Design a protein around this nucleic acid. Sequence first.
DNA 1: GGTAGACAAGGA
DNA 2: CTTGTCTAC
Length: 252
Amino acid sequence: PELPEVETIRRTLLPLIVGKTIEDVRIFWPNIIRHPRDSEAFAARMIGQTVRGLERRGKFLKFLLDRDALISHLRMEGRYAVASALEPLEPHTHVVFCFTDGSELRYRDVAKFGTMHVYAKEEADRRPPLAELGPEPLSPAFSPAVLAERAVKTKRSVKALLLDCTVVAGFGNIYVDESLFRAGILPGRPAASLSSKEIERLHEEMVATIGEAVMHLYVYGRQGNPCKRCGTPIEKTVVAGRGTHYCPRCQR
DNA sequence: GGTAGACAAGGA
DNA sequence: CTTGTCTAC
Ligand SMILES: [Zn+2]
């Protein structure tokens, strides 16, 4: 899921788990557990803690408990659901947190790409994987100046810069293409080639694009089809990855 | 020290 | 194939 989907998960999962006490943690694919490295220590330390909150950083969910934070990335297709301990597990359930009220927080992930790190709360933000994360796109910390400062230090594509989690948190592929389109900038352009009016436009389209999604696509997945503004066939190439979609006329 | 590819996997 | 980032050069 993209940042807006994760924020939707954050918001809807929280009431379903807040104030619940962990009685057991069950793990069926231990590699999902990245810290502590031993999954039995991961399970043991969680037990007896009550869930107090749920926050989001980039595409990371941060479950806040009594002493610890659980940092969770869904990556490709992880999913959480709350359900009764009396029901059979859905397929591809790899981690289950059992609550004292007989309900469960279940983590499913067909790919098994998702990760989990548990640290003392105070430590979470200065450890992998939150440590080097860039500012939230929708916050004051992510500004034209911050974006300007990074662009002018590197020769790589403006798309590659924006996909860099240290520049800005959780800006997905779909939103990079869309934002660049709306700002009229080519995804393959060197970051250091952008004018200051250009970075200000990009910054402002980044915030609007991600901001509308949080609360109708122009280029993403639309290759071969008429651009919605000028009617020029949308084109698809490879930039910093990765499927890159753009209009050759609208974007410069 | 600055940046990709490497790397995690089960199904078309 | 299909994705996100942080470890590896
Ligand atoms: Zn166009």
